Amino acid sequence: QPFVNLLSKATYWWMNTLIISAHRKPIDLKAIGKLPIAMRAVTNYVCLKEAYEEQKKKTPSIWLAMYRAFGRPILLSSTFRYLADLLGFAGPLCISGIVQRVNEEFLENAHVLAVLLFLALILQRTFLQASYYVTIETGINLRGALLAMIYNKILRLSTSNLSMGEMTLGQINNLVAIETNQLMWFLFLCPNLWAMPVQIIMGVILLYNLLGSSALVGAAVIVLLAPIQYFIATKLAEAQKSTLDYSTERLKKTNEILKGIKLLKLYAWEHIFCKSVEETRMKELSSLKTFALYTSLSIFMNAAIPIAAVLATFVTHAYASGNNLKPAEAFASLSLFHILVTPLFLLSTVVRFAVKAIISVQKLNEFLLSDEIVAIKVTNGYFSWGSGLATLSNIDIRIPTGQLTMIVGQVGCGKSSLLLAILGEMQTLEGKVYWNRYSVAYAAQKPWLLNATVEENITFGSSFNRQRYKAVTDACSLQPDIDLLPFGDQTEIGERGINLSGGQRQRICVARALYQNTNIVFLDDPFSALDIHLSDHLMQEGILKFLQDDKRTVVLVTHKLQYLTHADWIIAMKDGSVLREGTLKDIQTKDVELYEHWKTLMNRQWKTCWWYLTSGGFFLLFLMIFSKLLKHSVIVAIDYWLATWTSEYQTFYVAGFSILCGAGIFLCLVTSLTVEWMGLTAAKNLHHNLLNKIILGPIRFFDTTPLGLILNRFSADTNIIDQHIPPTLESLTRSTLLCLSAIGMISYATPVFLIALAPLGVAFYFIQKYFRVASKDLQELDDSTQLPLLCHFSETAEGLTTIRAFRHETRFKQRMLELTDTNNIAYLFLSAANRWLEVRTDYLGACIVLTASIASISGSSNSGLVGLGLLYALTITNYLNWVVRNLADLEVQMGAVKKVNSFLTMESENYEGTMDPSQVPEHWPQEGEIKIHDLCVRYENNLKPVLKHVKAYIKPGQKVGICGRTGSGKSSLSLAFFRMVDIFDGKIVIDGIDISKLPLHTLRSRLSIILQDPILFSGSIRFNLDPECKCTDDRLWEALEIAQLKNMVKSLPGGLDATVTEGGENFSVGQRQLFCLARAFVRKSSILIMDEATASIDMATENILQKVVMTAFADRTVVTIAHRVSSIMDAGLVLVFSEGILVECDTGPNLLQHKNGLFSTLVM
């Protein structure tokens, strides 16, 4: 009975059910059983950690610890691998014996030898496939522990700027994605280092015995394949490494277009800004050409050399040896080269991965050495962010139990430092910290949000309590902003989630601390980017009413001393030293100056598959498929030619043999180049069009579509097409022809074999049909679960302070251990499913050999031909698997092309204008007059007009003001000028021309608009002044001085051509608004649209805008939508829009004069 269990483990019958289930229902984690504790990340991490700690007892070596953990399984796998190679060598020996016994006793009989071959091949591949699976179990178990192990370091890292920085996040994000995968892949290929070289030595050893001194000449050439393959391998790495480099920043430029896409389209240089991506795109391809050529060359040397090896052998033996070639010798030896081609060709891969693994392990072992770390009573505190210099000195604070212990100080002054020191985030060189450590609900000063729901973010692993959630939402005033969110409390936020504003981001985290039921809180300047009212609102209810009900301690570091009276305690610290400790009563009496000085500052106020091929052009598609037929035609004839030559058992046969191999070598070059030459042309045309369609795409699409999904087309899907399809498409065509031809050639040698084909074809089709859908679905799971694992590691890296603060370590560790477990299963059952296919094609493959062996014995053909059929029988079993696995890989990759093709045909905005271009003369908007005729404006095809029946004549040069109710038709009207929102009815006429009846790009260009938050794109300031570059350089300097920025610019390096960070990082927010004004003047628009211009702008900077607008654009007409409606008091023409209706339309003073209308209530 236990033989049944051994067999079932040996042929992966256990996977079979799942495979069949894939047809009935998609395979999913529910359908896949839970991973055994023998392979869960917990046990693997414990084993590896125990080995590593024993090593640390003996710096410890990662390599030796990994061996001590995972040695026995790879020893077993290598034993299986040897037993597989030795039985694989039965192939040539059995073929030689058969051919000798045929053509005229227990072992000599061909039948007994034929059956022996059938048992050998079955046993060879049962062993060989099992040997692969053991390493995969070992390899995955290794990746299981490492991801757990390096994660333990992340929670124990230190956030000091010295030990952690922007460079640090590069390693950890890359270590999980790359360093471990390279280390895992090495383990998959670990046996080969001592398996393939043993086979190579044996293969040559047999060759000499088969032929004589001739085979060495052929063996010598074949040996040279491996050094060639390594030299080609290195050149691929440099070609690919450069290729990734251009691709990496090409995505960065892609992100800039896709984020803030409206901004580019408004200024009409969406086309021009796109071409900046094409410039890098051509360089990306210029790396690919060097890569594609070398990949084709690697294919060439994989085929041209063995054919040159045989040509070197048989020609040699025809002269060095008096004996004419015998049929048994030829096809025994000729088979052996096919046995040796794969290990010689792939040996460059295993050694290269050995180099990569040793690179990563050294990289990963450097990682581990990275630096690792009265409610609150601290006396004589001395804290330092490393650097051997106490960043905090003379620290002595007391935080009374269950009271608001607020801290006051100036810029710097150890503001955030004091809190983190209590949390163990920095070294305390002296003193002692007494939590008189409980869980501390610290709030990060910076905004760090998980890629999950707001409710999860506020609960943060706490049991839901809507009444407790109610007060938190009310006290932190999270209720109103929630209504705006798509899925409410189930709105996923963060980098993966919806992009928020700074003020709303801060309140979410603060709410978390109130949610957590702990005696201690550390609220770090929540009002950093908040309105004063909400902070006052929080100080009344959230700070006092909510917390005092819980009677928990609060330590709120504050900069406005107006709330110190509310504070039960005040802590004054400056220069990293505590100025004085005491309440407001104690501080004023003891430190009279502090009371006045603070108050002084307080006073201060598969049809796609065919579609993909045709992309290059019919000739390129024809040439590839036409030539590949010819290559096999010559190759097969070469194998046949030996049958004609060896049937003799001699300058004729050799002569015809050299030329054939000459064409075979040459045709190998042609069929190698044509496939890749298709790939680049197929790669270029697909991506080239795609960027155009997105740019012309409607703005409404970008609002609907998540930003993560759109960029995925250019990041992953385009990567698949460019680099993965041409390799797979090459191997599929090569493997199919070999399988199609070999079955043909065997059948031609033994026509009786065709009767035996009827069942075998049926069996192959069912395995081909069923596995494809089972591998495709598992493939989706492997990618699906891999991505959140990387997201978790990046999320835990950022803001470890909170994780250490809340004592959320263990819960977060558990999340990772389960997250990786869901990922290993997907990859493990992807490899086990793939193994199931390989076993059941060899069990099928052995049947082809067995039928070919038995049929050939019965046939009385030429002794060479019966040998030839057996040769292809052995080759079939090798390639009959890759015709399925590559096809599955091709089918999945055709998914990317299907997605791209949809985007290509999905949508466009109508850039063409019906009226002739001659209609618009030079400087059309010069007049500046605006005319609105019964306008109706709604972006969504079926929706109410956001602007309805709008009509208000605008005089030329009139600083018209438009305002109303918050969220009631104010900004929509702005884009209505820019036609971004379709004017379903009515019309807008500017200077006697309806804006609808004009080319779209003309309308966008000749206008000037300023959004609420200006954004500056990567490049020079000249790039941000005129991407079109048409404007002469003289004007560019004028605008900055007009914008009052030229003086600031001159200090910057490079003068006018000064590099600018993407997104306006270099310039301050106030400075950012200055950049737009520079763009405003150059256009000579005569129309300015300042929608929410003063919004998100400091009052000091705001005065400049009013100074600039009244002066710089006096002749221009400024249609202002003010953040503060008071600025429209002096507007000569003022429009009020409520519910999409012109509720008030008169002069500013006349608005108060006519009646206490909407504007009058708006201001007052």
Ligand SMILES: CCOc1cc(CC(=O)N[C@@H](CC(C)C)c2ccccc2N2CCCCC2)ccc1C(=O)O
């Ligand atoms: C675990 C993922 O990877 C594997 C890994 C293995 C273990 C393994 O030494 N393979 C040999 C193949 C045989 C022909 C030697 C090999 C060696 C060097 C380079 C690649 C490969 N192979 C692996 C990558 C695909 C190309 C051939 C088996 C099977 C697989 C697999 O596909 O599932």
Ligand SMILES: Nc1ncnc2c1ncn2[C@@H]1O[C@H](COP(=O)(O)OP(=O)(O)OP(=O)(O)O)[C@@H](O)[C@H]1O
């Ligand atoms: N995590 C850290 N790593 C290294 N240096 C730090 C760290 N936190 C603070 N410092 C340094 O300690 C000093 C005082 O920082 P402090 O805690 O007062 O900041 P802050 O006033 O809260 O900051 P900000 O208001 O700019 O956000 C500064 O020199 C600062 O660079």
Ligand SMILES: Nc1ncnc2c1ncn2[C@@H]1O[C@H](COP(=O)(O)OP(=O)(O)O)[C@@H](O)[C@H]1O
């Ligand atoms: N992307 C969107 N999709 C659907 N409706 C929106 C979208 N953005 C805004 N709205 C709604 O349309 C109105 C537009 O208001 P608007 O006139 O643009 O002034 P503001 O921009 O100051 O809200 C808002 O009340 C809002 O509720």
Ligand SMILES: [Mg+2]
């Ligand atoms: Mg700070």
Ligand SMILES: [Mg+2]
């Ligand atoms: Mg608005």
